[PDB]
């Protein structure tokens, strides 16, 4: 749940 | 053709969409699910593309119900409620947002665009700024939903690193998104956009 | 294997991507383009998915060059330049944004996330608000680019109604977007988000 | 060019 949101954000770096 | 009533083909497609995602959805799997031969279904539905267009539109009919300004609504309230409503449509089925992507706009939708502009400009937006505002709220919303929906379609095979290998900020970020989900972030961003336009429109004659 | 150097397979894939789009891209068409048998290419590249991951990352290497704060940059300038840079990456190839969609984040990217948060919070954002801000700017940007790129992939078969059947507002909107394209709208929206956070952070202890 | 932007916007209504 939380793990996937941070996954999304990390993708844009 | 009770089995193949338009509304029953639509519902079947929606349920299939939830079962296999936009990837898996084929007119063939629809034929099996409805229990009919492929050429019988082909009489009603030409191809995957024509089927998605119908799914996109249905989703919007059922859920995108706040597409025009209520009697004396402020433009902020309108923008907010319209974004929420569009978002409930996209979220209503698996891959909602991709389904929506590339489907042609219907005639009533153009007409709605027109009213939406009439309204905003009658509230004192320049035509340039009305378009920028509807455009930004739409991109932001569309972008929110593709990401949220990409998650549980990538949930299947791939996995995240374990919560406890993370640097400590990232680790509090997990806790936090665990507790709230994604709605609060969307609402917060929506509200920042709308505030940012508000500073915009208050510009009117000068510098900001 | 000069023909099949990693960097030559990557470039070939990119050129193929531009020729046929994400739809058309197959490991088979890559094999023909490079002039080698499919099992020879399969030694280097397992499948369509592994190939896209590599394309996604390459695009970001070449173009997403403003991913961390410059020595004493303000957070507004950072957010702005980072959004622009991410956008130049997505735009650099046909279907850039879909390619990017669902690809796993690399280890350095997690690390960059972490620094990006360290920075924002050291500028006085709560961890909650730093995440909301990076998240909104990202969605907005991603959403901008999928739409812009969906256009010229739907340009092929479908067409718009003629410019002169339109209600008069919609008709000025065409003129306007004809002249400016889509960059100005993106920049305007970016700038509204950032302003909206600014009102946010100035809240700090109270009500706004 | 312009025709496609309005197409995008009309889609969200």
mmCIF file of C-alpha atoms in Angstrom, chain B residues 80 83-84 87 140 144 176-177 180-196, chain C residues 75 125-137 139 192-204 208:
data_model
loop_
_atom_site.group_PDB
_atom_site.id
_atom_site.type_symbol
_atom_site.label_atom_id
_atom_site.label_comp_id
_atom_site.label_asym_id
_atom_site.label_seq_id
_atom_site.Cartn_x
_atom_site.Cartn_y
_atom_site.Cartn_z
ATOM 1 C CA UNK B 80 -12.937 20.888 -7.439
ATOM 2 C CA UNK B 83 -12.095 16.943 -10.904
ATOM 3 C CA UNK B 84 -13.419 14.617 -8.173
ATOM 4 C CA UNK B 87 -11.705 10.873 -10.995
ATOM 5 C CA UNK B 140 -3.254 16.307 -12.877
ATOM 6 C CA UNK B 144 -3.055 10.706 -10.514
ATOM 7 C CA UNK B 176 2.319 7.652 6.052
ATOM 8 C CA UNK B 177 0.989 6.407 2.686
ATOM 9 C CA UNK B 180 -3.813 7.505 4.195
ATOM 10 C CA UNK B 181 -3.769 5.892 0.749
ATOM 11 C CA UNK B 182 -3.697 8.253 -2.192
ATOM 12 C CA UNK B 183 -6.937 10.204 -1.957
ATOM 13 C CA UNK B 184 -5.536 12.820 0.488
ATOM 14 C CA UNK B 185 -2.590 13.587 -1.860
ATOM 15 C CA UNK B 186 -4.921 14.025 -4.754
ATOM 16 C CA UNK B 187 -7.221 16.316 -2.776
ATOM 17 C CA UNK B 188 -4.240 18.351 -1.514
ATOM 18 C CA UNK B 189 -2.806 18.814 -5.024
ATOM 19 C CA UNK B 190 -6.233 19.714 -6.455
ATOM 20 C CA UNK B 191 -6.543 22.298 -3.768
ATOM 21 C CA UNK B 192 -3.056 23.726 -4.484
ATOM 22 C CA UNK B 193 -3.843 24.074 -8.215
ATOM 23 C CA UNK B 194 -7.026 25.842 -7.524
ATOM 24 C CA UNK B 195 -5.298 28.179 -5.059
ATOM 25 C CA UNK B 196 -2.578 28.905 -7.659
ATOM 26 C CA UNK C 75 12.713 24.800 -3.661
ATOM 27 C CA UNK C 125 8.231 21.474 4.524
ATOM 28 C CA UNK C 126 6.668 18.862 6.718
ATOM 29 C CA UNK C 127 7.399 15.351 5.397
ATOM 30 C CA UNK C 128 3.653 15.051 4.533
ATOM 31 C CA UNK C 129 3.736 18.206 2.398
ATOM 32 C CA UNK C 130 7.051 17.401 0.694
ATOM 33 C CA UNK C 131 5.548 14.136 -0.550
ATOM 34 C CA UNK C 132 2.293 15.810 -1.633
ATOM 35 C CA UNK C 133 4.275 18.400 -3.588
ATOM 36 C CA UNK C 134 6.578 15.935 -5.463
ATOM 37 C CA UNK C 135 3.653 13.726 -6.076
ATOM 38 C CA UNK C 136 1.458 16.510 -7.531
ATOM 39 C CA UNK C 137 4.140 17.925 -9.764
ATOM 40 C CA UNK C 139 1.255 13.468 -11.791
ATOM 41 C CA UNK C 192 0.148 27.534 -10.469
ATOM 42 C CA UNK C 193 0.978 24.341 -8.525
ATOM 43 C CA UNK C 194 4.111 25.800 -7.188
ATOM 44 C CA UNK C 195 2.299 28.997 -6.178
ATOM 45 C CA UNK C 196 -0.400 26.911 -4.432
ATOM 46 C CA UNK C 197 2.233 25.139 -2.362
ATOM 47 C CA UNK C 198 3.811 28.405 -1.554
ATOM 48 C CA UNK C 199 0.488 29.542 0.012
ATOM 49 C CA UNK C 200 0.554 26.115 1.677
ATOM 50 C CA UNK C 201 4.024 26.383 3.323
ATOM 51 C CA UNK C 202 3.283 30.041 4.440
ATOM 52 C CA UNK C 203 0.407 28.459 6.413
ATOM 53 C CA UNK C 204 3.018 26.729 8.674
ATOM 54 C CA UNK C 208 -5.556 29.726 4.927
#
